[PDB]
Subunit: 485 residues, 3 copies
């Protein structure tokens, strides 16, 4: 009479295919997708403060477009700028539009403190029929269209010191009229000038008296410039004409605020990661939704699928063990022992090796990857305009980052899956050689992941081999007589 | 009488040295270079459309330099700009030259549609002796040098709507004369002005009446600007003077087109990857030729050599096996069995383990690397000018990319070679323990990668061990009597 | 009588914790920090030439601020710009300040060659009380404030050819006065002009007659521009007024020079790597001190600690061997043999496997990492100003690089530590199976990393097993009689 102890591992009929260093496509028992390929479709408004620019750009809310009067003094961690947005005030252009938009977005607040500028000998609060405030004519609420008073426009020259402890942002402008008649009617001088200076900075702009396309009934423009006044510094606005003055300063801050062009609707939910396609869950280490991200988002990768083997290698199917096949009928644990003796066939898992493999497998990826990279303000990555050098450089930087992180994700998945598979085979072989070392001369490796044990082995003794208390010398005198004789 | 079965692997006298994680320099049987270090020397003109700018820059072909009249309406996937190139027309400078060059290169076409601009009260088709068209005086063929008609130069003011479904590109200019006499002779106003506007954009340029170096007999210049008109938009050209008008618009496209500064000649061959040094083969995953690439090119790496072990570890040299030495006299396969019995010494490979190792080794690198990264338009990376901030940023981005990809290539080669070596030793040891499991108690591991088999083993039985049909129990009663007695 | 040979490895009570692919926190015998987290606090002035800008910016030393007269013609490999720096001359602003600063820093020399500009009909060597040279009024020493001579300011128009073999750098300026009275008093024309041109370049600047904050007693400014003249080219300075001419040219070079904002003091020591926090040792492959680097510096990584296992796995504690525990009482070598026989217990290391493991472990990281990346001039990474697009792009490039290199460092440490641990366990198991192959049938694996040897084994024979000369057949007839009987 002899016994048989086969060592084995769990298998599943539902084998998931993964990628490794050594195999293009290998079948494992379980796998987790690391690439968030689909979004919720909606921008969840927590924990980040989401400001919906329903029909307003950021610059139109800054300047005070009347339909953006509902954005006076609004703060945000993300400004969602809709493609539906339009302007309904005096036609304007921002030289260096993207820089102003970016610094106002990172500022995270349109907190406008009005200041007592003493514009003397000049008519304030100029207006236009291209911005009906409500009824009648108006203008940007955060600007002051100055025009001649009587028969002259003096050389305006005012100062404003920054005695506070923060950067002030002064949004000013220059009026480019259409005709010299319009110039000399608004500003008596034949060609104006707007200088705005600090102790360390300068901008001087000569207006551009020339006609141009009719936008809301005007062949004139406002060229919007800005000036950042540091603490202790001082602003000076000098002007010979064509000045669109500021009424005050925008309280600059520095923080996690940003801006995002999106058309997805906001919804009352919770999500750390926001994309133009909506909020996504940050549970996975990579994504494929969009490269434009805000918050604790995963990394963007070109790959649409990257399956990490969070389980072992699958070999789905005389009680032969692991050298031949894996066991489908073992859910008690990962690695285990089947056994055949006179007291009846049976099975029992080994939670030691199972729990070792799970302890190594449960926390694999989170010890070579980041928490979830919190990126709040980044470069622009979707361009509507054609600009050339700086746009191509931004595109190239982002494409470089994307290709590098895609390669890193591919190599990481391959390495971690190869290590998972070698680790699980290692635990199986370690259990095998452990049981070999318990059965010094009382057993023989049959070659199918199984020990033929040459003494009568009741289920108590099979359990003794399973749990490690098996003393070989009790049965040695019998097993040698059954092996070599 | 006893037999002897040694297991072994192929070896070669021509051992190639490679790098791993664990060994600085280890000898393997075969190795493939992954870094394309040398070029063909010629730019192959397929599958990409290569336009040879024989003596023409891209901007001189855009504007219509007479010796670039052969580039009217030419399209390309790559514009090869020769260092031999020169200008032979009115001296000019492009403020933001690189941006115009880049967007015209990505445009991939100089398709110029002439438009009926109504320049009234003004003499069109001005010319110069600094561009002989052929005989006589001429000008850029895609521009229109306007000058006074009679005794006055009116305030030119024309419009052109973009009712089409593509971006129009209007290349216009401003004439900077040398003297006020030249100004008031060409343009009656003492100081001109050129405004070019759309519903959302602006450029207004006051000319610069001042002398400057004589280039082709002139101390005057053309400052070339551009304006991109989106669909539905409208262009307006206003001017008080010094206008170099456009005759039409360049049909902007968006695609795989680009530009490359090179002196290599074009040749009728096929190659996906183009560099300034010539076309190179894209068979290898990395390169060292140049960082400037067009097409399906490998990645640039600082390394000049990176040998991937596409073979196993080399140990070149009583029929002792793999624990001692490798076999030079085995080409039948990778892993194999030598044997010594009474019926004569012999040898035979094992195609199972050989083909396993080759199946794992043939497709290693192409399951963690990209297809071949198709990069068409990228930043400029070789600068002739000194520009400071943007140039240093482009250089830093490219050097960052190069160092990162060089490190990735080094780590990848080390990892893949270490995995190759461990994999081949693993297949050898797996075959060894397989043969151990076939020879349960009939054999003994001699310690030189060899089993001394303690029964008479004819060549049929050695083949039985080789192919897996060896049943131990037939010879057990004899082998135990020969081992322990 | 029987003997016992246990194989084992060294252990230490001082176990250092490290990170791997398979274990979050595993205990090893020795570990090296790869992240230089602390600096010396001082900038060591060798081998790089360090120029201490004690109270001088680079532009103030370029132009010739009087308290920077001690920096005439100074050369550097690194210009240390102090936060204590101030200007004490005519108030000025540099449009494109950062580009001029960067190209003058990479130039690595303020070598100023004076040229014989023939400014005729005009008063040279203008001065101001905002730069007392020493006593009296003066100006920038490398500029020439031109003013009217008598009752007229002619149209200045001079040329200067670059007949040399290097780029010349001409630093010129434009005077923006406060009042039209000041303009027409200094420069008779009501609105000046400064054109500076070459055969391929242009800059024309109309001054800005407007008041502005009083800096050192003046509401006027100098707008500093530059012009780089290549070999064979020619400079032409034309001016209707408001010209701040150059007295000569700065000899541009190209090399390892750079600039760094720092407050750390210089000290006479030796160090290749300089940061604003001081010089640091470049012995480690990564750092956490600062991302701003000059010289042969390590790579910046967000991690503050990254311990590389330069030793094996620690298992600190009947002479049981390596399967159970590691040995604390073995310093002779890494892997070794303990033994118990009738001639007394004893111990002896195996320098073969020890030296194999050390040869593999001593040079691990330096065969997948770089020498130490020499980066001399890079982008600016700490910004005092808010600028928007280009600043955000520089920040994003550097943050991308930092996150990528941090991930690479983490993955590299995990991989190299996992390979160290698997390599050391591999050498231990290889020694174990070597000793198994020496003791073919004379021994039995007890299961605690130990062979019970079934013949009397004097210390000479234990040494025979240790050094490899052990012939099994001498003791086989006795060991079989002691094992199976
Ligand atoms: C491009 C454009 O708008 N051109 C305008 C047109 O809209 C308008 O009907 C007309 C009024 O004088 O002037 C012109
Ligand atoms: C730099 C330059 O070309 N200067 C020109 C020179 O070429 C020419 O001989 C002369 C003609 O008046 O005017 C001056
Ligand atoms: C901002 C600033 O400096 N403003 C100046 C002030 O310093 C000076 O006291 C005064 C002299 O007229 O002119 C004003
Ligand atoms: C808007 O902002 C500032 C912030 O202090 C405040 O003083 C001002 O009165 C506010 N006005 C409105 C209408 O919110
Ligand atoms: C302009 O006002 C500023 C206020 O800072 C002052 O410096 C300067 O004296 C004034 N100039 C004139 C002409 O009023
Ligand atoms: C996300 O939106 C971008 C831009 O609209 C689009 O290119 C991409 O295909 C979208 N992806 C998903 C998963 O919706
Ligand atoms: C050049 O381009 C446009 C493209 O349609 C065409 O209308 C025009 O007549 C072409 N002229 C020549 C000479 O190729
Ligand atoms: C200039 O022409 C444009 C054409 O779009 C038009 O808007 C404007 O009325 C014209 N102005 C004058 C003064 O002719
Ligand atoms: C390729 O060309 C570049 C620029 O001419 C040169 O720096 C490099 O050494 C060349 N490489 C080869 C392999 O020809
Ligand atoms: C400074 O630089 C140039 C370099 O040749 C030299 O000719 C000049 O005389 C030097 N002057 C002083 C004071 O160092
Ligand atoms: C100005 O001087 C330059 C010197 O290069 C010359 O080209 C030009 O003839 C001069 N013009 C006048 C009006 O003197
Ligand atoms: C180095 O200096 C920078 C800037 O002053 C600071 O942010 C950083 O904490 C410093 N690090 C060390 C290690 O001193
Ligand atoms: O775009 C339509 C508008 O164009 C302009 C003027 O002719 C307006 O009267 C007209 O309503
Ligand atoms: O550069 C040479 C040219 O220079 C200028 C004029 O003096 C021309 O007559 C002359 O041919
Ligand atoms: O900032 C102080 C200075 O301001 C200005 C003038 O009023 C000076 O007289 C004064 O000393």
């Amino acid at each position: 009479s002899t016994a048989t102890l086969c060592l084995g591992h769990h298998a599943v009929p539902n084998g998931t295919l993964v990628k490794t260093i050594t195999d293009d496509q290998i079948e494992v028992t379980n796998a987790t997708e690391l690439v968030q390929s689909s979004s919720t479709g909606k921008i969840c408004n927590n924990p980040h403060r989401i400001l919906d620019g329903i029909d307003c750009t950021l610059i139109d809310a800054l300047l005070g477009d009347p339909h953006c009067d509902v954005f006076q003094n609004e703060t945000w961690d993300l400004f969602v700028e809709r493609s539906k947005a339009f302007s309904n005030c005096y036609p304007y252009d921002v030289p260096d539009y993207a820089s102003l938009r970016s610094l106002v977005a990172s500022s995270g607040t349109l907190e406008f403190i009005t200041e007592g500028f003493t514009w003397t000998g000049v008519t304030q609060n100029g207006g236009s029929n291209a911005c009906k405030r409500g009824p009648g004519s108006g203008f940007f609420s955060r600007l002051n269209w100055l025009t001649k008073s009587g028969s002259t426009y003096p050389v305006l020259n005012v100062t404003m010191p920054n005695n506070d402890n923060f950067d002030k942002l002064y949004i000013w402008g220059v009026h480019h009229p259409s005709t010299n008649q319009e110039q000399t009617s608004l500003y008596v001088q034949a060609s104006g000038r707007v200088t705005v200076s600090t102790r360390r900075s300068q901008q001087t702009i000569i207006p551009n008296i020339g006609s141009r396309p009719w936008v809301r009934g005007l062949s004139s423009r406002i060229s919007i410039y800005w000036t950042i006044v540091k603490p202790g510094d001082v602003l000076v606005i000098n002007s010979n004409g064509n000045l669109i003055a500021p009424r005050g300063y925008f309280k600059m801050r520095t923080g996690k605020s940003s801006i995002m062009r999106s058309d997805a609707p906001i919804d009352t939910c919770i999500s750390e990661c926001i994309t133009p396609n909506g909020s996504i869950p940050n549970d996975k280490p990579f994504q494929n939704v969009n490269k434009i991200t805000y918050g604790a988002c995963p990394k963007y990768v070109k790959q649409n699928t990257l399956k990490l083997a969070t389980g072992m290698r699958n070999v789905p199917e005389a009680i032969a063990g692991f050298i031949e096949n894996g066991w489908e009928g073992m859910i008690d644990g990962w690695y285990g022992f089947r056994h055949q003796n006179s007291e009846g066939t049976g099975q029992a898992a080994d939670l030691k090796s199972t729990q070792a493999a799970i302890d190594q497998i449960n926390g694999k990826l989170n010890r070579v990857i980041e928490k979830t990279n919190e990126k709040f303000h980044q470069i622009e990555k979707e361009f509507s305009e054609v600009e050339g050098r700086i746009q191509d450089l931004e595109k190239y930087v982002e494409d470089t980052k994307i290709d590098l992180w895609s390669y890193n994700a591919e190599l990481l998945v391959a390495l971690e899956n190869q290590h998972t598979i070698d680790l699980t085979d290692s635990e199986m072989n370690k259990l095998f050689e452990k049981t070999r070392r318990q059965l010094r001369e009382n057993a023989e490796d049959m070659g199918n992941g199984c020990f033929k044990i040459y003494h009568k082995c009741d289920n108590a003794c099979i359990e003794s081999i399973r749990n490690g208390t098996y003393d070989h010398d009790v049965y040695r005198d019998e097993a040698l007589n059954n092996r070599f004789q």
